[PDB]
């Protein structure tokens, strides 16, 4: 399955694939080190993962 990247917001890049004609499959989230410390990236995920779980298909384990 071919992957592609989208910008969720500046510095935050999600890698997606097609899945079952519904939500795209989330493969990874990349945080620009120009814009994010590791602490800020972990805070971003804590703040945004709820939305991410609903907008995308996210394997939980």
């Amino acid at each position: 399955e071919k992957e592609w990247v989208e910008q969720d917001e500046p510095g935050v890049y999600i890698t997606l694939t097609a899945l079952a004609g519904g939500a795209r499959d989330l493969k990874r989230v990349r945080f620009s080190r120009k814009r994010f410390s590791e602490i800020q990236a972990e805070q971003w995920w804590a703040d945004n993962r709820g939305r991410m779980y609903e907008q995308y298909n996210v394997r939980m384990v």
Binding site: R28, V29, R33
Partner: peptide, 16 residues
């Protein structure tokens, strides 16, 4: 669960 990967110098990666 998702894992943080911190070995790249350009991006922090959360690998699902």
């Amino acid at each position: 669960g998702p894992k943080w990967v911190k070995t790249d110098s350009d991006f922090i990666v959360l690998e699902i």
